[PDB]
Structure 1
Amino acid sequence: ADDALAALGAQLFVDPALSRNATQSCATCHDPARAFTDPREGKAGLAVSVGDDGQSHGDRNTPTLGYAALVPAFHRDANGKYKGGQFWDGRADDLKQNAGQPMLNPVEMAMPDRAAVAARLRDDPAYRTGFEALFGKGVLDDPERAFDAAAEALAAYQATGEFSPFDSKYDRVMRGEEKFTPLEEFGYTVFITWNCRLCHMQRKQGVAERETFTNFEYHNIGLPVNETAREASGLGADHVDHGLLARPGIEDPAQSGRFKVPSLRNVAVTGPYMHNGVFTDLRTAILFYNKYTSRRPEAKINPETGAPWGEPEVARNLSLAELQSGLMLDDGRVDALVAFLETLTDRRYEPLLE
């Protein structure tokens, strides 16, 4: 089942007939060639993706699908900290629940309802063969089963080795196959002795077996609005992205502005950065952390804009305990981190580095 189930998910992933005007598939916004992210440019750059209607833009940046399958389902641990889930705000429990929402999102694939999606699947005899072999006959005659099966197949497809190969240079180094460059090792050491490790490691202590450089927690690191992406989303300037608080069921006002800690795997090749896609460059996303540690004036400036970083979109709930480490990363270490984060790039996406 699960071998062929993924094959059906592979068919659907690249099928643009899951979108109203038949213009876009998962592969459109999650391009396999680009670490499963969107190469296309809308009104606000690559910060947000354009929907099926070629008009509607999202509010958030499209994340890699690579290594999302290792993120555990959304839950709250004994600490009181939330962990796991899908979407920058964790509003999806897991890959399965996540897969459906793009299909039905007017500002994305823009299928009006589940019934419309079923109709498209019956257009293909390939599906009626493949779907009915895995979920039995008549599956495509039922909107609810088909949509769900398609979501499940898409989920399964994303849980294959093709999405999480662990064939990055980091992976080969930890297996003893090759060594880090002095700068990469320096970056790793910095990465596991500075605040980076507090949020971007699977564990607090001990050895993780399949590290994806996220603890799956939710933090507000105090990012500002993305001026241009925000206009493009059409949600108004008065609108506030409350991150995790926007997940249904989450009412705790301490989670306002908190976003899922993203896996730093493939990070080098999935710009722009953060939930709102505000930072074009990776170096910029690293230097942003120094506004909490550096006494220096340049730390206040966003190097991309040349102007003050900007007031956080959400001022309260900052992870200051972690962020205010009393230690400023110098450029030397910022270099080191850029290098180490590059080692988390997959084999097939290594060529993209430059």
Structure 2
Amino acid sequence: PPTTVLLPGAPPERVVDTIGRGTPQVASKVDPTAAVFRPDPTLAALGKRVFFDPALSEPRGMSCASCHDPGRAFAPTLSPAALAGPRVPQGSRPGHFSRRNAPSLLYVRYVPRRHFYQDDDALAPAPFGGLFSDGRADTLAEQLRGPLFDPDEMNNASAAALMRKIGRTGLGAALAGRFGPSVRRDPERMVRVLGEAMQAYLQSDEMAPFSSRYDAYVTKRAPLTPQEMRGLALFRNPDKGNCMSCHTLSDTASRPERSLFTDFGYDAIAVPRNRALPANRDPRHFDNGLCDTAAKLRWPEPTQWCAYLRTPGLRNVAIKESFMHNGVFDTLRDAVAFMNTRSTDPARWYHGRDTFDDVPRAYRGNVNVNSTPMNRRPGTPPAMTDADVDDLVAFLRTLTDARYVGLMPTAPDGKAARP
């Protein structure tokens, strides 16, 4: 096709090729700020009701909010068992856990549909977009099927069973009131309209507040501290932090939405294995990220994408209880320190081993060793000092939306609060 629309309301994008089974390659970068969100207010309110309804799990008692706490920027507040164990959300039953850490859902409306784009300084197109860290859902409506029917999360047996359960409650009556009686008879329609309602909620302005001190710096040049400005400088310095090369920002713009702190692209940084995750009880099992989606979509040579994961946005990062797709780090400073010394000090991060412990041998070539600061060899000085790392942490704390600032720690290596 000549064009494709990758975010709601956005200008159509020129398609220059199709990769595998329907993934468009576009001619220009998607600008997430060009999207236009106009969710129907009562539809959004219905989606919010769904989001907080604990009847939607098996056994009952777990809602979306059980892993996406509104008091923590819709990132998980871990159960005591999860905090002591794998550091990813607990599912609907004791001893069952998500396969990955759950992100904040604030700003999720800006995640575009899957597409490829080849920058001027690139030999091949790169993948962007898709929901989940492996991009396996193209839209928010499609995403909903994941947690609802995952035995380790909300654990509904089938769409039919979920439909029967909902149909018997006030939620079923409300859905039938808006959509008509067939939502109580057709399980496919039930799932689809739940997705439409959830999409409206998650696309509402409530779910993209832009209320951080960084945002006040962008809109009004309200001053940050000298330390925070040192961290901002390191963050956009290609020779020190180089963070801006993947966690996109525009600190000279005046619109906060030009700073989402991700380009929604993918890379392979090889964070350490979290052996507390149930799936990793098999030492031959690895969560390989994007290549599972690439295989499903018949992208050519799909294992080139093994160990690739979607670059997360960093807004509200400093109130999370664990970090990276596998929750392996429990402090923000450790995540930043890892970026700086994975390549120079692998034994620190991989239990004395000199190379990655969560990437199969076959896929080690996929790991990024070219981007600063991951491009320095063992025994050479890292790009940044421990003081630089502290300053980066100080800067990342400016990305917390106003209502959540009290959850942040004060010590550079501190953990988010559990009030």
1:20·1:110 contact (CA, 8 Å) conserved in 2? yes
Q: Structure 1: how far apart are the matches of 2:353 and 2:75?
A: 29
Once the 2 structures are TM-superposed, how far is the Cα of residue 135 of structure 1 from its aligned partner?
Answer: 2.6
Once the 2 structures are TM-superposed, how far is the Cα of residue 279 of structure 1 from its aligned partner?
Answer: 0.6
The aligned counterpart of 2:272 is 224
The match for 1:6 among 22, 40, 44 is: 44
The match for 1:173 among 181, 203, 217 is: 217
The amino acid of 1:345's aligned partner reads T
Report the secondary structure of 2:338's partner residue.
helix
Q: Structure 1: how far apart are the matches of 2:305 and 2:268?
A: 8
Q: Structure 2: how far apart are the matches of 1:157 and 1:55?
A: 31
Q: Greater CA deviation, 158-167 or 39-48?
A: 39-48
Indicate yes or no: 2:298 matched with 1:254: no
Report the secondary structure of 1:321's partner residue.
coil
Q: Structure 1: how far apart are the matches of 2:141 and 2:71?
A: 23
2:279·2:285 contact (CA, 8 Å) conserved in 1? no
The amino acid of 2:217's aligned partner reads V
The aligned counterpart of 1:199 is 246
The match for 1:18 among 24, 38, 56 is: 56
The amino acid of 2:103's aligned partner reads P
Q: Structure 2: how far apart are the matches of 1:73 and 1:14?
A: 26
The match for 1:65 among 87, 91, 105 is: 105
Compared CA separation, residues 20 and 126, structure 1 to 2 (3 A): closer
The alignment's TM-score, normalised by the length of structure 2, stands at 0.76
Indicate yes or no: 2:188 matched with 1:113: no
The alignment's TM-score, normalised by the length of structure 1, stands at 0.90
**Which is bigger in relative contact order (C-alpha 8 A, separation at least 6)?**
1
Report the secondary structure of 1:228's partner residue.
coil
The aligned counterpart of 2:335 is 285
Once the 2 structures are TM-superposed, how far is the Cα of residue 325 of structure 1 from its aligned partner?
Answer: 5.1
1:100·1:148 contact (CA, 8 Å) conserved in 2? no
Q: What is the correspondence of 1:123-142 to structure 2 with a 5 Å cutoff?
A: 123-129=168-174, 131-142=175-186
Q: 1:299-336 CA deviation, whole Å, 9 max, x = no partner? A: 7414xx98568624222211222144556111221111
Report the secondary structure of 1:82's partner residue.
strand
Once the 2 structures are TM-superposed, how far is the Cα of residue 64 of structure 1 from its aligned partner?
Answer: 1.2
Once the 2 structures are TM-superposed, how far is the Cα of residue 152 of structure 1 from its aligned partner?
Answer: 1.9
Compared CA separation, residues 126 and 19, structure 1 to 2 (3 A): closer
Structure 1 segments of 4+ aligned residues over 4 angstroms from their partners: 205-209, 305-310
The match for 1:238 among 284, 304, 307 is: 284
Indicate yes or no: 2:122 matched with 1:76: no
Once the 2 structures are TM-superposed, how far is the Cα of residue 350 of structure 1 from its aligned partner?
Answer: 1.3
Between the aligned residues of both structures, percent identity stands at 35
* Structure 2 residue runs without a partner (length 5+): 1-38, 120-124, 377-381, 410-419
1:89·1:260 contact (CA, 8 Å) conserved in 2? yes
The aligned counterpart of 2:371 is 322
1:42·1:49 contact (CA, 8 Å) conserved in 2? no
* Structure 1 residue runs without a partner (length 5+): none
Once the 2 structures are TM-superposed, how far is the Cα of residue 202 of structure 1 from its aligned partner?
Answer: 5.6
The aligned counterpart of 2:316 is 266
Once the 2 structures are TM-superposed, how far is the Cα of residue 2 of structure 1 from its aligned partner?
Answer: 1.5
RMSD: 2.5
The amino acid of 1:238's aligned partner reads R
Report the secondary structure of 1:253's partner residue.
helix
Once the 2 structures are TM-superposed, how far is the Cα of residue 35 of structure 1 from its aligned partner?
Answer: 2.2
Once the 2 structures are TM-superposed, how far is the Cα of residue 29 of structure 1 from its aligned partner?
Answer: 1.2
Number of equivalences: 346
The match for 1:156 among 193, 200, 203 is: 200
Indicate yes or no: 2:185 matched with 1:185: no
Q: Greater CA deviation, 136-145 or 342-351?
A: 136-145
Once the 2 structures are TM-superposed, how far is the Cα of residue 292 of structure 1 from its aligned partner?
Answer: 5.2
The aligned counterpart of 1:350 is 405
1:41·1:49 contact (CA, 8 Å) conserved in 2? no
Compared CA separation, residues 333 and 149, structure 1 to 2 (3 A): same
Compared CA separation, residues 239 and 3, structure 1 to 2 (3 A): same
